[PDB]
């Protein structure tokens, strides 16, 4: 996260770290959506241009974390993966269209003050909140700058951007399965996700029921926090029918 700040304790209790077993290192962010299911970006698990194709036994999920590098004894919980599910129409060849994946845990995680699931949006909450200018919150342990790494989880609030502005900021083809967020050059304020924040959640607090909803997944950007560029997020609601199909048939 570029130009963010340290999270408060318990501020993002759905935050998940994807962790490689060997070498032991951070791979990506992710989010907790129930006691057995974690949501992430598909490119965290499968990206052939970078020779990335992880299997379940390659990975661990670390939940309840605040420090990036510490083993947070008595606070974090570490879970093994039973199965990975990648969207069948995930487009790693072109533009990361449908950049979404689910991971089922081997055993349910116990909730605590530090571990708690985020809500997924219904159609009405998505329609009401996914509007240009409305702000969401992005969190992660990724790079602090494009060109180092944070001691603790970082958080930044960013406004959703009008779709024509998103499209006009890039040569990459944008789809309805994406939205973009970030400040414009004339707005002054700054902030973006960066490498290592992949797969982490873009959340909004509904003013109707005071619950946090995950509207996006950190997907891609051209540089980090560059003027005139924006961060692109997987549109969770647009892909919710697939999420529901996976959980109903494999839960």
């Amino acid at each position: 996260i570029v130009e963010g700040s340290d999270a408060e304790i318990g501020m993002s209790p759905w935050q998940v770290m994807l962790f490689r077993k060997s070498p032991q290192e951070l791979l990506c962010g992710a989010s907790l959506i129930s006691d057995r299911w974690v949501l992430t970006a598909a490119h965290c698990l499968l990206y052939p241009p970078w020779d990335k194709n992880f299997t379940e036994n390659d990975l661990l999920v670390r939940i309840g974390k605040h420090s990036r590098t510490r083993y947070e004894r008595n606070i974090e919980k570490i879970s093994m993966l039973e199965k990975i599910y990648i969207h069948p129409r995930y487009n790693w060849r072109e533009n990361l269209d449908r950049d979404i994946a689910l991971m089922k845990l081997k055993k349910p995680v116990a909730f605590s003050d530090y571990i708690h699931p985020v809500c997924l949006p219904d159609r009405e909450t998505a329609a009401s909140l996914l509007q240009a200018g409305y702000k969401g919150r992005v969190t992660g342990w990724g790079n602090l700058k494009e060109t180092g790494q944070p001691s603790v989880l970082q958080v930044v609030n960013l406004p959703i951007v009008e779709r024509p502005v998103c499209k006009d900021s890039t040569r990459i083809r944008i789809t309805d399965n994406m939205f973009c967020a970030g400040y414009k050059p004339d707005e002054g304020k700054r902030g973006d996700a960066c490498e290592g924040d992949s797969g982490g959640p873009f959340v909004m607090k509904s003013p109707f029921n005071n619950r946090w909803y995950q509207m996006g997944i950190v997907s891609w950007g051209e540089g980090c926090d560059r003027d005139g560029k924006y961060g692109f997020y997987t549109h969770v609601f647009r892909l919710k029918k697939w999420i529901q199909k996976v959980i109903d048939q494999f839960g």
């Binding site: 408060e8 605590s112 607090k205 003013p207």
Partner: peptide, 28 residues
């Protein structure tokens, strides 16, 4: 789940975090 999106250390105790008001103010 039925309790999703309500944080133990914030919503469940009626405590606000230091920047959530910035989000609310944008929901115009």
């Amino acid at each position: 789940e039925a309790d999703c999106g309500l944080r133990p250390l914030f919503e469940k105790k009626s405590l606000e975090d230091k920047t959530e008001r910035e989000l609310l103010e944008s929901y115009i």
